[PDB]
Design a protein around this ligand. Structure first.
Ligand SMILES: NC1=N[C@](c2ccnc(C(F)(F)F)c2)(c2ccc(F)c(-c3cncnc3)c2)c2cccc(F)c21
Ligand code: NA
Length: 375
């Protein structure tokens, strides 16, 4: 159960998240579970569904304990409902431990499971404040920490699929260069502060609070980089200007349609780099993470369109603040240092580059003219 044995423990389908193998109950029932830093519930399919390969059968587990409490989770894009209980949980390619944890057994859902995603539940890695029904339902990671000697930290290396989730430590073979830390502003979602945004080195010149309206989070459970309306509109204007040698339909910029090029001819050079400057651990100091088009133009695999390489624009508008989703995390080694209330970023071993540009994590940067960038 060493970090080496944890490397390459994630798999996934593009736009459908990354999952880890887990076991639930006694005797153990193997399930694939999506790793979600944007939620705090451990919620698993517990009844048949057209999109489920398998599901949690509580009647077969002697260690199952019913909490006699229902949970109903309607959210913007769908819903899930279930029953709360506790059971024995393990991660075969994770720490060499078995813990007793809360489990929300999903008995009914709407647009939650995805056809052929290969996962049957979600592991919410964020804090109790956002747990459903309320903050009294201890999240999985909290239980893992309380019950074992596992250090209060985990890291994600998402590769654009596969990757690694390292529990209880930092694996140096997963990144190059330096780890730069940004503070966790509040322990609910993994909330952070963006202090500056540049598109091909050009500052968006907005008050930095706009970038964090009403919060900015790091979410492995969201595919896109999602931006507040004002920021999204300025970003699109700037990307369109940089890429103006080619004109795309409005639907492409809305994520409503694909852009396709003859296989291997994607004009990466016409698309700009996006730099997100994150608040440093010291006053008015920041570092930047740079995103290439290979990260924000998400390939859509489809045998029918395979004479071409087709992409969806993976930057979208949000009315609930910035979401640094999978397209941002890909090619960075992201350290969720809960013990030190900070999130670390470093260039990943599976980072993005072509022969002209490389994703980067760079600093420090100084801004003497700064106000508080948070809401
Ligand atoms: N971050 C999130 N996890 C949720 C979510 C919403 C409500 N409850 C949960 C639960 F069950 F984990 F608590 C998760 C989720 C649910 C189902 C999914 F298929 C996916 C997903 C992830 N990656 C790629 N494609 C789809 C995400 C979800 C839905 C909407 C916005 C979000 F930011 C999230
Ligand atoms: Na991708």
């Amino acid at each position: 159960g060493s970090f080496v044995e944890m490397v390459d423990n994630l798999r996934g389908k593009s736009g459908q998240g990354y999952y880890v193998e887990m076991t639930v109950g006694s005797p153990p029932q193997t399930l694939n579970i999506l790793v979600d830093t944007g939620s705090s519930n451990f919620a698993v399919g517990a009844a048949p569904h057209p999109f489920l390969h398998r599901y949690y059968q509580r009647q077969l587990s002697s260690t199952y304990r019913d909490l006699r409490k229902g949970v109903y989770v309607p959210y913007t894009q769908g819903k899930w409902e279930g029953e709360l209980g506790t059971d024995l949980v393990s991660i075969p390619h994770g720490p060499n431990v078995t813990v007793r944890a809360n489990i929300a057994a999903i008995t009914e859902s709407d647009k939650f499971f995805i056809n052929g995603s290969n996962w049957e539940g979600i592991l919410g890695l964020a804090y109790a404040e956002i747990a459903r029904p309320d903050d009294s339902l201890e999240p999985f990671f909290d239980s893992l920490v309380k019950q074992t000697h596992v250090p209060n930290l985990f890291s994600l290396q998402l590769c654009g699929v596969g990757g690694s989730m390292i529990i209880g430590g930092i694996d140096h073979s997963l990144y190059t260069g330096s780890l730069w830390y940004t503070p966790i502003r509040r322990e609910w979602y993994y909330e952070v502060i963006i202090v500056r945004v540049e598109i091909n080195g050009q500052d968006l010149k907005m008050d930095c609070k706009e970038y964090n309206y009403d919060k900015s989070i790091v979410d492995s459970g969201t595919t896109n980089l999602r931006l507040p309306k004002k920021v999204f509109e300025a970003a699109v204007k700037s990307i369109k200007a940089a890429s103006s040698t080619e004109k795309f339909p409005d639907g492409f910029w809305l994520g409503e349609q694909l852009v396709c090029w003859q296989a291997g001819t994607t004009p990466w050079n016409i698309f700009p780099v996006i730099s997100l400057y994150l608040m440093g651990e010291v006053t008015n100091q920041s570092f930047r993470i740079t995103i290439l088009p290979q990260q924000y133009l998400r390939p859509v695999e489809d045998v029918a369109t395979s004479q071409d390489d087709c992409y969806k624009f993976a930057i979208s508008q949000s009315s609930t603040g910035t979401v640094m989703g999978a397209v941002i995390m890909e090619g960075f080694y992201v350290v969720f240092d809960r013990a030190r209330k900070r999130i670390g970023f470093a260039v990943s071993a599976c980072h993005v580059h072509d022969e002209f540009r490389t994703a980067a994590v760079e600093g420090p940067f100084v801004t003497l003219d700064m106000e508080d960038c948070g809401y």
